[model samples]
Target chain A: SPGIWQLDCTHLEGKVILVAVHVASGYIEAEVIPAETGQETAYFLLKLAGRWPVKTVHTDNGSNFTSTTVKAACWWAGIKQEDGIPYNPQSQGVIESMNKELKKIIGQVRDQAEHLKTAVQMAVFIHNHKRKGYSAGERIVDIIATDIQ
Target chain B: SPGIWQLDCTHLEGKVILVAVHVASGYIEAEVIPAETGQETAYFLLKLAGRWPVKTVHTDNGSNFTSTTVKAACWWAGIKQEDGIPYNPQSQGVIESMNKELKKIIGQVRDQAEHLKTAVQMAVFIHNHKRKGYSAGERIVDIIATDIQ
Candidate 1:
């Protein structure tokens, strides 16, 4: 609760990707978009959170995240949107650092893959499936199962 | 030589205030907005910039500032628009601090004023006329006169 996670976007090979991270669980979600627009960001985020409930979202005051489309989406979904202090990326350390790690992974796979988005997908898969000692997917599954049980 | 200032909206007593702060001179310009929409924010910002030549603007990734309407206005005005890092208001410390001061001043006058916007205007007037041991208006006038000479 104290060290809540964050969401953000990064550019890779002329493509924009929206990234969301769970701070405690080290879970991350990524999606490639043609452009980083509020509409695209809102749609993708809503889709992502449809599976995993998100209470609050922290992001930089980027146009995509601040646009009416994004704001309305969050409002409708019952998620609180927070703008981090300007010029302070450190406040969103979780997503920022995850973006960096994703970039490095993308770099490692850049030459091997034909499509960068495919490489990103693979990177995210490996990241969630194996990078951390316990997989994020597994952790989420366990948490949800325990609740159901 | 004219770097465009930044613009943002803050709320006071259920009213929206459009705040513009020149980065170089620390000069402040503000107006009341009906709503914090892209159209409203863009119209006011353009109106304010019309008085002085603005080359580029930096703003937080608020929906109002990032909307197509605002972007088109800035583009038409030949002004470059830059979004500050998401979740980072500290990067926009100058205006943020000014906003905080404005809110404080507004608080002081809240009980005495019939119209809060008028009170806010007075607060801004005093802030520009004399604050931080110097006058922002005087500084801007001097800078412009120097440039003219």
Candidate 2:
């Protein structure tokens, strides 16, 4: 409702890299890096989609997304790249909400330090299974299929 | 291992209740009166706390755990809570084996449920997340994170 919400990262280091996701199934593949830069983010995404053929990639102007490695990956994968306005939080609400809830639920199931991966799997399962009915009796799964059509 | 373990109760009347728990952590909590215990077990658990908090609670003994009201509250809290153990004929394990499994997997033995309803409460806690280090017996918060679906 107000200015786009922003979360500032003081230091980004992780033992196991993680990806942010959304309730509707879109996701941002992230990684646990010793440090951050254009190369790291791009590598994470590339590896995430290594087996699949990506058609399009969208992101904010984060250094990683704009990095050469990322650009090359896009070219190699024959995918188009689109950028959202820099620092515009609302532009990524779907992914952000997914990340936030994932964080919250992970904390709920167990400490974040423990059971991180298992928690992610379970969280996604719960999210899909438990979404509020889009219609009186229609499930989110139904809505997802309808949108696909 | 000696006698049946029971926990506190909000009401003296025998009621139908359920306790759901996580398999990893031996943490137990109870909900009273599904179609019938209405908010009683939740009230009882909030009041009772000692050295360890309940991590995973289980309940398959009754339908109460899955009901709208109880399910909503538990998910919001974030414990790796799960459904009741099937009392079905195929539900493997005898009483002693169940106790050993709880000790090995979850942690501590639970105090018994006093009556029929509270018994469900105690069984769930006993089976959920009691760990090895504590209790010479057992082991194992969620505020905003719940199962809204």
Best by TM-score: 1
lDDT of 2 by residue, B1-149 (tens): 11112232222234443332223322334444634443444333222211122344453335546555445434543434355454553433433354444334222212321234323333343333233544212221111011112
- iRMSD per prediction, in order: 25.9, 19.1
TM-score of each: 0.45, 0.34
Candidate 1: which stretches are off by over 4 Å?
A1-149, B86-90, B131-133
How close is candidate 1 at the interface, in terms of C-alpha RMSD after superposing the true interface residues? 25.9
Q: What is the TM-score of chain A alone in each candidate?
A: 0.79, 0.55
Query: Quality of candidate 1's docking, in CAPRI categories?
Result: incorrect
Model 1: per-residue lDDT, tens digit, A36-77? 788677765554443344667776466745698778767755
lDDT (tens digit, per residue) of candidate 2 on A1-149: 01011211212224433452222333222334555555555544443332222345554456645688667645544556666443666646655565676566556755422434444444444443443523211232232223323
| lDDT over C-alpha atoms for residue A15 of model 1 | 91
For candidate 2, the docking band is incorrect
